[PDB]
Design a protein. Structure first.
Ligand SMILES: [Ca+2]
Lengths: 223, 14
C-alpha cells in the first residue's frame, strides 16, 4: 500500500498473508476453511497466515495453516488477467474469533464512487522498495468503468474495476495482490494489477468479486 | 505496462 495508514493490530481480521518463506500475496477469509486470493498468486505449498499484524514477528494471535487446495478460476487468463481469482481451501478449519473473522460476499455489485478499504503488506513506495512490518490500509473510491477504460485502453474486462486516485500517490502495490477491497462490509474486489503503482492516471485494477459468487459457492460445495 | 502486484511481480511490455 502506497499512501496508506497503519491499520492497527487485527483491525482487518479477514486479511490473510500467503507465505512461501516470505510474504508474497494477500487474501481474504470467507469462511473457516476458505480464502479468496488472485489466480496470479497461485503456487504449490502455500502457507496461510491468519491473525497477523507484524508479519516479521510471532506475536501470539496468529494461526498458520497450510493450503490443502489452491484452485484458480478455470478460465483465468495469465496474459489479459481476466478471471484473476483463486480459492484456497485450508488443511484444517481456522478458529474464528475477534482477530480471525470471515468477510461477507456481496449480494450486489458496488457502484462507482463507493468508498472501500484496501489493505496489505505490500510495498509502500511507488518507485523503489520498502516493505512494512505491520498491515497498511487505504481508503479509496471505486472509479467509473469509463475512467477505468480511459486509463487502460483495451485492457479492462467486465470482470475488472478500477479504484483509487487519478492524481497518484495512493494505491495498492507489489505484495498486496490477492488481498481485499471491502465496501460497506462486503468483499467487492481482489488486488490484481496496474501500470506501476500510485502513478498519475494509472489507478489500481481489481477483480470484480460480485461476478464470481456462484462459482465460489459451487467450488466450496465441490471441494 | 501491465504489472501484477505479487512478489515478485509479472509486468509486461504493454
Ligand atoms: Ca506476526
Amino acid at each position: 500500500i502506497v499512501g496508506g495508514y497503519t491499520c492497527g493490530a487485527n483491525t482487518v481480521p479477514y486479511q490473510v498473508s500467503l507465505n512461501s518463506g516470505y510474504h508474497f500475496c494477500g487474501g481474504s477469509l470467507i469462511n473457516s476453511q476458505w480464502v479468496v486470493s488472485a489466480a496470479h498468486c497461485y503456487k504449490s505449498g502455500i502457507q496461510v497466515r491468519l491473525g497477523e499484524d507484524n508479519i516479521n514477528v510471532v506475536e501470539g494471535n496468529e494461526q498458520f495453516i497450510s493450503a490443502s487446495k489452491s484452485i484458480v478460476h478455470p478460465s483465468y487468463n495469465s496474459n489479459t488477467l481476466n478471471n484473476d481469482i483463486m480459492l484456497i481451501k485450508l488443511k484444517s478449519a481456522a478458529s474464528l474469533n475477534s482477530r480471525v473473522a470471515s468477510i461477507s460476499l456481496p449480494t450486489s455489485c458496488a457502484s462507482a464512487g463507493t468508498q472501500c478499504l484496501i489493505s496489505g503488506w505490500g510495498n509502500t513506495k511507488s518507485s523503489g522498495t520498502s516493505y512494512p512490518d505491520v498491515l497498511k490500509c487505504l481508503k479509496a473510491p471505486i472509479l467509473s468503468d469509463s475512467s477505468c477504460k480511459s486509463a487502460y485502453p483495451g485492457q479492462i474486462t467486465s470482470n475488472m474495476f478500477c479504484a483509487g486516485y487519478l492524481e497518484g500517490g495512493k494505491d495498492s502495490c507489489q505484495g498486496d495482490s490477492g488481498g481485499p477491497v471491502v465496501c460497506s462490509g462486503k468483499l467487492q474486489g481482489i488486488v490484481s494489477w496496474g501500470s506501476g503503482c500510485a502513478q498519475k492516471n494509472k489507478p489500481g485494477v481489481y477483480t470484480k468479486v460480485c461476478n464470481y459468487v456462484s462459482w465460489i459457492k459451487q467450488t466450496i460445495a465441490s471441494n | 505496462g501491465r504489472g501484477t502486484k505479487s512478489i515478485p511481480p509479472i509486468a509486461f511490455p504493454d
